[PDB]
Symmetry: C2
Subunit: 120 residues, 2 copies
């Protein structure tokens, strides 16, 4: 069990397909900061509810997805195998053993990008 820290930074999702991904925006950072979380999808289910309700809004199927706490589908050429959505990526392995959800470290990436980061 762990909790969320950090400030994130001010589509941003068009950036998700290169470099280290996109940052967790400040407003979302502000809303999750200090919340304890049982597991990794619990934290991820919190992040995406936040994109929806923050008018950063996403085609109809994508707006519906995030509203229920699902990552939105990436473009076809950015998906890989069964991975069709945006993924949360730790820029460094510093989760302090899954005790921290450092929202300055955590980034948003396409599957293609995220695999290319860790290697491919």
């Amino acid at each position: 069990p762990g909790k969320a820290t950090g400030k994130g930074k001010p589509k941003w999702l068009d950036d998700a397909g290169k470099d280290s991904g996109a940052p967790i925006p400040d407003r979302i950072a502000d809303k999750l900061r200090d919340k304890e979380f049982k597991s990794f999808d619990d934290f991820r289910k919190a992040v995406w509810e936040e994109v929806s309700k923050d008018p950063s809004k996403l085609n109809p199927s994508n707006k519906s997805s995030v509203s229920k706490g699902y990552s939105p589908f990436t473009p076809k050429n950015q998906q890989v195998g069964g991975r069709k959505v945006y993924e949360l990526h730790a820029d460094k392995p510093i989760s302090q053993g899954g005790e921290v959800y450092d929202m300055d470290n955590i980034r948003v990436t396409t599957p293609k990008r995220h695999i290319d980061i860790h290697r491919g």
Copy 2:
């Protein structure tokens, strides 16, 4: 475009049971030897080769349930136990132990491991 190199490890039946612990399960040595010095255009095509070769191997496929057999026959990764799945990530994932692909130019089958989405996120830091 990148080429496969490597060797992998001898594994038994139940090799996938180890995919949710430590650094994941090794590519089996028989698989690596079928794939060595092959060229793959994309990471997907390498992933597809790995799983098509799994389906063509009695001892490596035999613990696989009927659903996962159908998956691997087509080059798709097999589904993990439910408690190893995370969000839309439901099938085993190929993982680089170290970031040593040389910009995608190699698939090092000593470095590449088979993990569950749960373990995989944990390795990189959840």
